[PDB]
Amino acid sequence: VKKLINSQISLLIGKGLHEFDSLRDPEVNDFRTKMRQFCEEAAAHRQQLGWVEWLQYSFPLQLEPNRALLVNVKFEGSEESFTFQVSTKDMPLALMACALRKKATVFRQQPEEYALQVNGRHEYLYGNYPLCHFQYICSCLHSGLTPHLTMVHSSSILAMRDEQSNLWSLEQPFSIELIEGRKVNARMKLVVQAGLFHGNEMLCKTVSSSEVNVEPVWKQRLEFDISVCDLPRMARLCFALYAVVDCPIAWANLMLFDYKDQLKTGERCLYMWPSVLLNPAGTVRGNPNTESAAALVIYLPEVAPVYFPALEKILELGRTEEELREILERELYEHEKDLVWKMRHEVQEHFPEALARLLLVTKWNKHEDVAQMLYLLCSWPELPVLSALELLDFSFPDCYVGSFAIKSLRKLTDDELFQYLLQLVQVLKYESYLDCELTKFLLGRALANRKIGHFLFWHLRSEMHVPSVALRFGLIMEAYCRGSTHHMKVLMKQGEALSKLKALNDFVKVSSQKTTKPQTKEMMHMCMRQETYMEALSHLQSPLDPSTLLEEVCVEQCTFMDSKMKPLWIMYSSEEAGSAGNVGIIFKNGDDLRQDMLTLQMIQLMDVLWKQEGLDLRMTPYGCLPTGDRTGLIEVVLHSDTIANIQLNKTAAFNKDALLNWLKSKNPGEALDRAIEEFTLSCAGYCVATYVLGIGDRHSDNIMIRESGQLFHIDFGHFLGNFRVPFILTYDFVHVIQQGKTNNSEKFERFRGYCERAYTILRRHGLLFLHLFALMRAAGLPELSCSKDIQYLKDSLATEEEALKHFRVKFNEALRESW
Numbered sequence: 002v003k004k005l006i007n008s009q010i011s012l013l014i015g016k017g018l019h020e021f022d023s024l025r026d027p028e029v030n031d032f033r034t035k036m037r038q039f040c041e042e043a044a045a046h047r048q049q050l051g052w053v054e055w056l057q058y059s060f061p062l063q064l065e066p067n068r069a070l071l072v073n074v075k076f077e078g079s080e081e082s083f084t085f086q087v088s089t090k091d092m093p094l095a096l097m098a099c100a101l102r103k104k105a106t107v108f109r110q111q112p113e114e115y116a117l118q119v120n121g122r123h124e125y126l127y128g129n130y131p132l133c134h135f136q137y138i139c140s141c142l143h144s145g146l147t148p149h150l151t152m153v154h155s156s157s158i159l160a161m162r163d164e165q166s167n168l169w170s171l172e173q174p175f176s177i178e179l180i181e182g183r184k185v186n187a188r189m190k191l192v193v194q195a196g197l198f199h200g201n202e203m204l205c206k207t208v209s210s211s212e213v214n215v216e217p218v219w220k221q222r223l224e225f226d227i228s229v230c231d232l233p234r235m236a237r238l239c240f241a242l243y244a245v246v247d248c249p250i251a252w253a254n255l256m257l258f259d260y261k262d263q264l265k266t267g268e269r270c271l272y273m274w275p276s277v278l279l280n281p282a283g284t285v286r287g288n289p290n291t292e293s294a295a296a297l298v299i300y301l302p303e304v305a306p307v308y309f310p311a312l313e314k315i316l317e318l319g320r321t322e323e324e325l326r327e328i329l330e331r332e333l334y335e336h337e338k339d340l341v342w343k344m345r346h347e348v349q350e351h352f353p354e355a356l357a358r359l360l361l362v363t364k365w366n367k368h369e370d371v372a373q374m375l376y377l378l379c380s381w382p383e384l385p386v387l388s389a390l391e392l393l394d395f396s397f398p399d400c401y402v403g404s405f406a407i408k409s410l411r412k413l414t415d416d417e418l419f420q421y422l423l424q425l426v427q428v429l430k431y432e433s434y435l436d437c438e439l440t441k442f443l444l445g446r447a448l449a450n451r452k453i454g455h456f457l458f459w460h461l462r463s464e465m466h467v468p469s470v471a472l473r474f475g476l477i478m479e480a481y482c483r484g485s486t487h488h489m490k491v492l493m494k495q496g497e498a499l500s501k502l503k504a505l506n507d508f509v510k511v512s513s514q515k516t517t518k519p520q521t522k523e524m525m526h527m528c529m530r531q532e533t534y535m536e537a538l539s540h541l542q543s544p545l546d547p548s549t550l551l552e553e554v555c556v557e558q559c560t561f562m563d564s565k566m567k568p569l570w571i572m573y574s575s576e577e578a579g580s581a582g583n584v585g586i587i588f589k590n591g592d593d594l595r596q597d598m599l600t601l602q603m604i605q606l607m608d609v610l611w612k613q614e615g616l617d618l619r620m621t622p623y624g625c626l627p628t629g630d631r632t633g634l635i636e637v638v639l640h641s642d643t644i645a646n647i648q649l650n651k652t653a654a655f656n657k658d659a660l661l662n663w664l665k666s667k668n669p670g671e672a673l674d675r676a677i678e679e680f681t682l683s684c685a686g687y688c689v690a691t692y693v694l695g696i697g698d699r700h701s702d703n704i705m706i707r708e709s710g711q712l713f714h715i716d717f718g719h720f721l722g723n724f725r726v727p728f729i730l731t732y733d734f735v736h737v738i739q740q741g742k743t744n745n746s747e748k749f750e751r752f753r754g755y756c757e758r759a760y761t762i763l764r765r766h767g768l769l770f771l772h773l774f775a776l777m778r779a780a781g782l783p784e785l786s787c788s789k790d791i792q793y794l795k796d797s798l799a800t801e802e803e804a805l806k807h808f809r810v811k812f813n814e815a816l817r818e819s820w
């Protein structure tokens with residue numbers, strides 16, 4: 002029955018479906034019904050896809066942004082495998098051909114009927130791409146390991162697709178009636194400041210309430226300096242309740258128009274949110290804690306059925322100098338703004354990419370000016386992805402503006418969308434109504450690609466404990482589940498594994514105080530070996546990456562760590578995969594993993610940007626994913642250790658040698674020079690990464706080394722210099738770069754070049770970083786709160802020559818400070 006699926010979605014999304022009904026809201030009812038059909042349409046289209054098209058949905062290719070190698074190939078229903086010697090320039094088809102020919106001669110006798118599955122992973126190799134373009138092959142060629150693949154036939158992929166089925170007339174000013182208030186605070190008098198906003202900008206000057214002593218009654222008329230006909234569609238009425246002899250108490254906002262474009266009237270009770278003065282960026286929906294939250298009773302006076310005019314009507318109304326207009330194009334005065342508005346047609350024709358600057362000069366408090374702009378917009382050419390990401394910020398609130406940005410993001414690759422998905426999910430907080438183009442797009446892309454679908458779910462699910470977004474986020478996940486009954490069940494398994502891990506972590510935390518670690522470890526081990534634990538912790542997709550399969554839990558290899566939140570070290574094995582199935586996951590409960598994930602995503606973007614310029618600084622883009630309330634996962638980077646642990650053996654005469662001696666033991670003979678190259682490149686990338694991102698409090702316990710020599714960072718506590726952090730250079734690292742030699746300028750000057758190139762490449766994309774950090778402000782991160790945080794990134798990135806010289810000033814100060 003359908004009831005079991007409804008109860009399944011409920012337990013999964015972490016909110017009962019009945020709770021959407023209890024509210025008795027037609028906006029919630031319309032979102033649910035409309036979006037459900039949209040997702041069921043998307044689910045249907047998927048079931049009739051060709052086997053390759055389905056493989057592109059389920060297991061999208063892991064691609065990279067000559068030489069011969071041994072590759073092991075086996076067929077689905079057999080233990081028999083053949084090891085072939087193929088090239089890195091060879092296409093998957095030639096490998097499939099070899100695999101077929103060898104099967105035909107052994108068993109005594111077409112490659113376009115198969116696909117190559119990565120052993121013990123939900124990863125596949127297909128398409129006209131040389132084998133060296135696939136991430137699994139590339140990880141194998143660097144680690145030395147042999148790629149193990151499985152020949153999967155069309156009819157078997159088709160069996161999966163089958164078992165995975167389911168107006169202008171009102172010229173009087175805008176006014177309201179502030180009736181009465183409620184709840185606590187000191188003696189003093191309560192003022193209610195009220196303003197009207199279109200994004201970050203006021204449509205008129207604020208009007209404050211008359212001073213009333215502490216449950217208060219106002220019954221006062223508040224009028225605004227704006228005509229009702231001049232109100233923009235996305236106008237926000239913002240309130241702030243505070244005390245004065247200031248002390249802020251509460252805040253609440255609301256759209257003057259509903260989801261059906263109707264100008265509201267009638268009384269309204271406003272369950273306000275506790276303050277840290279006016280917050281326009283805040284949610285336009287009341288506090289769900291209607292019991293303990295302060296309420297503002299207000300009245301929307303009648304003006305009578307007034308609906309915001311249709312596009313056909315907006316377009317009906319909307320239907321040199323030239324030199325100084327270019328000079329201001331590459332924070333501006335009023336005469337400069339008037340010039341841009343006068344020249345608005347020349348902006349569309351010769352500077353389409355300057356649209357954002359034009360959208361900020363338009364008087365949104367004048368319907369005629371809005372119409373004249375919307376008319377230009379309804380003929381405006383598509384903007385590049387970069388400029389479109391700027392148009393998603395709270396500074397651009399108009400619905401038609403918002404719809405144009407999505408229209409420019411449709412061209413985005415599933416790879417590019419994956420990179421900025423964290424920012425696009427945050428932008429959901431800025432949205433005014435449940436039903437939006439952003440949700441329809443995010444949902445459309447989730448259901449068209451199972452990896453986008455996976456991460457969109459976890460981005461939403463991880464924020465379910467946040468009351469301001471719980472309804473929106475819950476509604477989106479339920480809409481998703483209707484479009485994928487099978488994936489819903491897959492994500493449910495993941496939630497059961499994480500449910501067991503929290504209980505096991507709670508036990509560990511308690512036990513670590515009551516007894517010694519070897520005694521707590523055997524108890525963890527004993528608790529894990531219980532039926533329910535063995536079942537729940539095994540045979541699941543990794544929330545860190547759906548292509549990674551967590552098969553049998555290796556209880557003996559599991560442990561906990563000695564740090565504050567006693568994190569769990571959970572290891573896995575798989576016979577099929579061999580070594581690819583020997584993965585590990587770290588479960589952390591107690592700290593906020595959101596920032597660590599962002600820091601790692603920003604470093605992952607830097608890697609992508611460098612790799613695109615041919616520069617491979619041998620980075621370690623390991624997974625970090627918040628899954629719940631101060632709960633998350635970290636990807637285990639195997640064959641790695643901390644600097645502090647390496648600096649103590651289980652032989653060095655001096656500390657400076659310890660690091661180099663460890664590399665010497667893990668990379669003997671001709672391999673050592675490779676490990677030092679890995680160290681030099683990775684070190685340089687993380688020197689530019691930590692510097693630009695403003696990562697301080699870096700020490701031996703949070704910096705790690707792989708047995709390959711690759712250096713990487715962990716447990717990023719504070720970013721954007723939020724303790725102006727300088728460049729960091731360590732004697733122990735410089736020693737390794739300089740090959741143990743006290744003096745080595747060739748090796749050090751090469752390393753100085755890597756730091757320089759890495760820095761200059763990122764400076765060219767400085768706008769990409771600034772747009773993504775701007776969009777990220779929505780998340781609520783105490784380290785990305787204001788413009789001074791954006792300004793940190795502006796200063797660490799800063800003409801190319803006048804900035805590169807200034808980088809050398811910081812680089813030289815870092816080398817001299819090194820003892």
Ligand SMILES: C[C@@H](c1nc(-c2cnc(N)c(-n3nnc4ccccc43)n2)nn1C)N1CCOCC1
Nearest residue numbers: 562568570587623635636637638641642643715716
């Ligand atoms: C020394 C230490 C060890 N840690 C790692 C390792 C690997 N990958 C990571 N992503 C990683 N990170 N990253 N963020 C973290 C946050 C907390 C803890 C760990 C973290 N830590 N490897 N090893 C051997 N323990 C030896 C005994 O067994 C338990 C592990």
